[PDB]
């Protein structure tokens, strides 16, 4: 389970993709959720 979190222009976008079995493959993460909240995110 891979996840990518980024905040730009007030939109909070996430990306994820599920695959069986770490560096022995290549897979691009597809967009799943995009929510405009515009809050300032600095720590997680």
């Amino acid at each position: 389970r891979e996840f990518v979190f980024k905040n730009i222009d007030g939109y909070f976008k996430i990306y994820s993709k599920h695959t069986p079995i770490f560096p022995q493959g290549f897979s691009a993460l597809e967009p799943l959720v995009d929510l405009p909240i515009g809050i300032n995110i600095t720590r997680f």
């Binding site: 222009d9 007030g10 939109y11 405009p36 515009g38």
Partner: protein, 49 residues
Amino acid sequence: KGKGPNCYFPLQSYGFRPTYGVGHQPYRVVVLSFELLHAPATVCGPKKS
């Protein structure tokens, strides 16, 4: 310290009755307040297709 001289209850009841005049009938008022803060506009009007 209680009800008496110079101490009156600030809240008063209407008591709506169907036999009242047009000026005393109950009127439900809804005020729409729009915000234009620095944020993505999540609210928009309908779009015809």
